[PDB]
Design an enzyme around this catalytic site. Structure first.
Site, PDB file in Angstrom:
ATOM      1  N   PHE A 179       0.833  -1.014   0.036  1.00 43.98           N
ATOM      2  CA  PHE A 179       0.323   0.085  -0.070  1.00 43.98           C
ATOM      3  C   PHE A 179       0.984   1.234  -0.118  1.00 43.98           C
ATOM      4  O   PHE A 179       1.835   1.413   0.623  1.00 43.98           O
ATOM      5  CB  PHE A 179      -1.045  -0.015   1.164  1.00 43.98           C
ATOM      6  CG  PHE A 179      -2.163  -0.755   1.477  1.00 43.98           C
ATOM      7  CD1 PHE A 179      -1.645  -2.133   1.273  1.00 43.98           C
ATOM      8  CD2 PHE A 179      -3.152  -0.806   0.694  1.00 43.98           C
ATOM      9  CE1 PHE A 179      -2.458  -3.370   1.243  1.00 43.98           C
ATOM     10  CE2 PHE A 179      -4.325  -1.905   0.865  1.00 43.98           C
ATOM     11  CZ  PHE A 179      -4.158  -3.139   0.754  1.00 43.98           C
ATOM     12  N   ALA A 180       1.134   2.458  -0.343  1.00 45.06           N
ATOM     13  CA  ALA A 180       1.424   3.846  -0.946  1.00 45.06           C
ATOM     14  C   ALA A 180      -0.028   4.706  -0.804  1.00 45.06           C
ATOM     15  O   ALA A 180      -0.071   4.844  -1.776  1.00 45.06           O
ATOM     16  CB  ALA A 180       2.419   3.511  -2.165  1.00 45.06           C
ATOM     17  N   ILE A 181      -0.735   5.161  -0.295  1.00 45.53           N
ATOM     18  CA  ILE A 181      -1.743   6.318  -0.001  1.00 45.53           C
ATOM     19  C   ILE A 181      -1.212   7.534   0.677  1.00 45.53           C
ATOM     20  O   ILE A 181      -0.125   6.976   1.823  1.00 45.53           O
ATOM     21  CB  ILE A 181      -2.720   5.374   1.184  1.00 45.53           C
ATOM     22  CG1 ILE A 181      -2.760   4.225  -0.346  1.00 45.53           C
ATOM     23  CG2 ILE A 181      -3.756   6.362   1.275  1.00 45.53           C
ATOM     24  CD1 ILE A 181      -3.450   4.163  -0.724  1.00 45.53           C
ATOM     25  N   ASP A 200       4.747  -3.811   3.948  1.00 45.70           N
ATOM     26  CA  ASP A 200       4.588  -2.165   4.028  1.00 45.70           C
ATOM     27  C   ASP A 200       5.838  -1.700   3.170  1.00 45.70           C
ATOM     28  O   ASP A 200       6.956  -2.750   2.492  1.00 45.70           O
ATOM     29  CB  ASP A 200       5.279  -1.911   5.922  1.00 45.70           C
ATOM     30  CG  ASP A 200       4.441  -1.560   6.802  1.00 45.70           C
ATOM     31  OD1 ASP A 200       3.734  -2.337   7.300  1.00 45.70           O
ATOM     32  OD2 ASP A 200       4.857  -1.457   7.874  1.00 45.70           O
ATOM     33  N   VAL A 201       5.440  -0.498   2.768  1.00 49.28           N
ATOM     34  CA  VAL A 201       6.091  -0.069   1.521  1.00 49.28           C
ATOM     35  C   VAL A 201       7.509   0.852   2.296  1.00 49.28           C
ATOM     36  O   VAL A 201       7.660   1.278   1.403  1.00 49.28           O
ATOM     37  CB  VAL A 201       4.968   1.330   0.427  1.00 49.28           C
ATOM     38  CG1 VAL A 201       4.846   2.081   1.779  1.00 49.28           C
ATOM     39  CG2 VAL A 201       5.440   1.324  -0.577  1.00 49.28           C
ATOM     40  N   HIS A 239       8.256  -9.464  15.416  1.00 44.87           N
ATOM     41  CA  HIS A 239       8.344  -7.837  15.526  1.00 44.87           C
ATOM     42  C   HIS A 239       9.731  -7.477  15.936  1.00 44.87           C
ATOM     43  O   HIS A 239      10.737  -8.619  17.036  1.00 44.87           O
ATOM     44  CB  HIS A 239       7.344  -6.771  15.950  1.00 44.87           C
ATOM     45  CG  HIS A 239       7.110  -6.063  16.252  1.00 44.87           C
ATOM     46  ND1 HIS A 239       5.850  -5.768  16.210  1.00 44.87           N
ATOM     47  CD2 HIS A 239       8.262  -5.155  16.689  1.00 44.87           C
ATOM     48  CE1 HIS A 239       6.629  -4.150  16.805  1.00 44.87           C
ATOM     49  NE2 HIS A 239       7.897  -3.620  16.784  1.00 44.87           N
ATOM     50  N   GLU A 256      -3.008  -5.256  13.735  1.00 44.44           N
ATOM     51  CA  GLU A 256      -1.006  -5.652  13.840  1.00 44.44           C
ATOM     52  C   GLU A 256      -2.129  -6.410  15.258  1.00 44.44           C
ATOM     53  O   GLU A 256      -1.580  -8.031  15.870  1.00 44.44           O
ATOM     54  CB  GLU A 256      -0.137  -5.235  14.406  1.00 44.44           C
ATOM     55  CG  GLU A 256       0.673  -6.067  14.583  1.00 44.44           C
ATOM     56  CD  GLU A 256       2.167  -5.597  15.558  1.00 44.44           C
ATOM     57  OE1 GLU A 256       2.571  -5.220  14.005  1.00 44.44           O
ATOM     58  OE2 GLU A 256       1.996  -4.020  16.025  1.00 44.44           O
ATOM     59  N   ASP A 283      15.090  -2.336  11.440  1.00 47.30           N
ATOM     60  CA  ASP A 283      15.174  -1.063  11.756  1.00 47.30           C
ATOM     61  C   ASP A 283      16.727  -0.743  11.756  1.00 47.30           C
ATOM     62  O   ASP A 283      16.886  -0.878  13.278  1.00 47.30           O
ATOM     63  CB  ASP A 283      14.532  -0.610  12.340  1.00 47.30           C
ATOM     64  CG  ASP A 283      14.373   1.054  12.192  1.00 47.30           C
ATOM     65  OD1 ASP A 283      15.011   1.790  12.268  1.00 47.30           O
ATOM     66  OD2 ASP A 283      13.793   1.234  12.775  1.00 47.30           O
TER      67      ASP A 283
HETATM   68  O1  LIG Z   1      -0.437   7.548   4.879  1.00 46.10           O
HETATM   69  C1  LIG Z   1      -0.257   6.208   4.657  1.00 46.10           C
HETATM   70  C2  LIG Z   1       0.037   5.259   6.139  1.00 46.10           C
HETATM   71  C3  LIG Z   1       0.479   4.098   5.625  1.00 46.10           C
HETATM   72  N1  LIG Z   1       0.114   3.645   4.686  1.00 46.10           N
HETATM   73  C4  LIG Z   1       0.671   1.710   4.605  1.00 46.10           C
HETATM   74  O2  LIG Z   1       0.482   1.115   5.764  1.00 46.10           O
HETATM   75  C5  LIG Z   1       1.907   0.801   6.488  1.00 46.10           C
HETATM   76  C6  LIG Z   1       2.103   1.220   7.884  1.00 46.10           C
HETATM   77  O3  LIG Z   1       3.039   2.973   8.092  1.00 46.10           O
HETATM   78  P1  LIG Z   1       3.885   2.843   8.966  1.00 46.10           P
HETATM   79  O4  LIG Z   1       4.702   1.845   7.852  1.00 46.10           O
HETATM   80  O5  LIG Z   1       3.329   4.069   9.024  1.00 46.10           O
HETATM   81  O6  LIG Z   1       2.983   1.897  10.006  1.00 46.10           O
HETATM   82  P2  LIG Z   1       4.076   1.022  11.219  1.00 46.10           P
HETATM   83  O7  LIG Z   1       3.957  -0.350   9.680  1.00 46.10           O
HETATM   84  O8  LIG Z   1       2.430   0.379  11.994  1.00 46.10           O
HETATM   85  O9  LIG Z   1       5.284   1.564  11.117  1.00 46.10           O
HETATM   86  C7  LIG Z   1       2.498   1.290   4.876  1.00 46.10           C
HETATM   87  O10 LIG Z   1       3.950   1.030   5.393  1.00 46.10           O
HETATM   88  C8  LIG Z   1       2.002   2.219   4.651  1.00 46.10           C
HETATM   89  O11 LIG Z   1       2.063   0.690   3.384  1.00 46.10           O
HETATM   90  C9  LIG Z   1      -0.012   4.337   3.835  1.00 46.10           C
HETATM   91  O12 LIG Z   1       0.704   3.838   2.292  1.00 46.10           O
HETATM   92  N2  LIG Z   1      -0.020   5.940   3.370  1.00 46.10           N
END
Ligand SMILES: O=c1ccn([C@@H]2O[C@H](COP(=O)(O)OP(=O)(O)O)[C@@H](O)[C@H]2O)c(=O)[nH]1
Ligand SMILES: O=c1ccn([C@@H]2O[C@H](COP(=O)(O)OP(=O)(O)O)[C@@H](O)[C@H]2O)c(=O)[nH]1
EC number: 2.4.1.40
Lengths: 264, 264
Positions: A50-52, A130-131, A152, A222, A245
């Protein structure tokens, strides 16, 4: 080489769970053998991402590094879920690799809907990540299995009372204080298309019930992912080599490779 | 208890193969979890055993000890293949357990024929063992998987050039000198009904070809079993806890339990 029955593949880490699922660390697997078994079946791997909003900015590095390190030599289909189709960068792909753009509680709901579509009929496994990440090293068919979660990176060393499971018993994600095998991260999970259908459907339906009861689980999907994987145990567990990380946690000696890491 | 990611389940033995199949040793598995997963599916295990000529004399102890130690709490169906139906001793069985007598190159041919019969439709897994044996300790659902072999107790410590594979290239069982993962014994193998169909059919068809070419593999069906399991890798491998001879090999410290042992 020859496996040696009297020599542990690792002497510093657990390489199998108490239900006999492999925990995937460097030194546990011979990639040549695994590549051959998976090529024999002409395996296709779907990767969802997802990339929002502002997250579209992570796709270019996510994709370029996927092309270097993710399932190379196998068939791969990326599924990018985005509110900006025009922001998807045009990354050149290796042979046998394809990318589709899908225009958009969300991740589970959406994967569950997409996972049931007939155009997925070619795909054998789904991997959901995650993206905001980049591949630095091999991520390949060693992960593939009917159901897998990933430890995790912040809790692999912790005891279960320290796990941030959902603790309110009114939440569908409720896990009692003396229950739990591991704390899995919602940033990397997958399995066969059927198991990912089942998992995302269960998490989505559970969250819907929580919503209808005025509760949001502490760690959102999660939390429900952890509840699901407690009751339906993964057939492989990925070590934190698969989700790391380096800015926050360094590079400890037990991690021989950092494969898939947060972008700073 | 809680699995601990930073503590090996065993520090003296290999607990997973290079293709990520678990190698089953005491201390690798939590039987409570495995029993629950298998009971949830109402699993039925078929156990095949041959007792021809003087070998009928081993059935009484084989069966009585099976009843104490083999798959207790699960559904079990023994299939005794014998040239003497009247010599089968009348052993009292626990609830959910049944025994059938089948009146009789032989083992593979016969299992392959029987394994394809419709009356097997209730059975989920088949386990195929020697009769000159007794159970001394738990043998349970930890072994169950699509395909498993057992390490020959005489070679688990050996290098592959020492393995007694078939070495003549005219034999279907031929394995080259720098090939091989383990030496498996023909005295204990099994898997789901479908995988046991496939394995016994392949070994029987291979032996037929060897016969049509005036060759008998050095270790007969065990040679073909090793060839099959080289090319179709087992999804679990049983440690020598599952097949032992205490008279010939003692009780080394690496074996925490002797489960299924030769009768003296
Ligand atoms: O505004 C946003 C927030 C989250 N995400 C997606 O949801 C995942 C989870 O958020 P982060 O990566 O912000 O969450 P953690 O994975 O909770 O750090 C991200 O990797 C994105 O793939 C997105 O695409 N747009
Ligand atoms: O005359 C015989 C010879 C062999 N067997 C069966 O075939 C197996 C293999 O023989 P042994 O047990 O004599 O072989 P290894 O398993 O080759 O010692 C036995 O366990 C029996 O189950 C039998 O029933 N009658």
């Amino acid at each position: 080489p020859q496996p040696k029955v009297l020599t542990p593949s690792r002497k510093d880490v657990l390489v199998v769970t108490p239900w006999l699922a492999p925990i995937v660390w460097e030194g546990t697997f011979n990639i040549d053998i695994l590549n051959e078994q998976f090529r024999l079946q002409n395996t296709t791997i779907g990767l969802t991402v997802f990339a929002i909003k502002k997250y579209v900015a992570f796709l270019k590095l996510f994709l370029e590094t996927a092309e270097k390190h993710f399932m190379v030599g196998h068939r791969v289909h990326y599924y990018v879920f985005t509110d900006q189709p025009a922001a998807v960068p045009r990354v050149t792909l290796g042979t046998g690799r394809q990318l589709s753009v899908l225009e958009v509680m969300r991740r589970m709901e959406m994967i569950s809907d997409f996972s049931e579509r007939r155009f997925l009929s070619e795909v054998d496994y789904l991997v959901c990540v995650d993206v905001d990440m980049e591949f630095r090293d091999h991520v390949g068919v060693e992960i593939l299995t009917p159901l897998f979660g990933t430890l995790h990176p912040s809790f692999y060393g912790s005891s279960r009372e320290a796990f941030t499971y959902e603790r309110r018993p009114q939440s569908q994600a409720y896990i009692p204080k003396d229950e739990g095998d591991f704390y899995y991260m919602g940033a990397f999970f997958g399995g066969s298309v059927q198991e990912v259908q089942r998992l995302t459907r269960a998490c989505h339906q559970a969250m819907m019930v929580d919503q209808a009861n005025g509760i949001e689980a502490v760690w959102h999907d999660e939390s429900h992912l952890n509840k699901y994987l407690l009751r339906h145990k993964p057939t492989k567990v990925l070590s934190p080599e698969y989700l790391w990380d380096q800015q926050l946690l360094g590079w400890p000696a037990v991690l021989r490779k950092l494969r898939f890491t947060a972008v700073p």
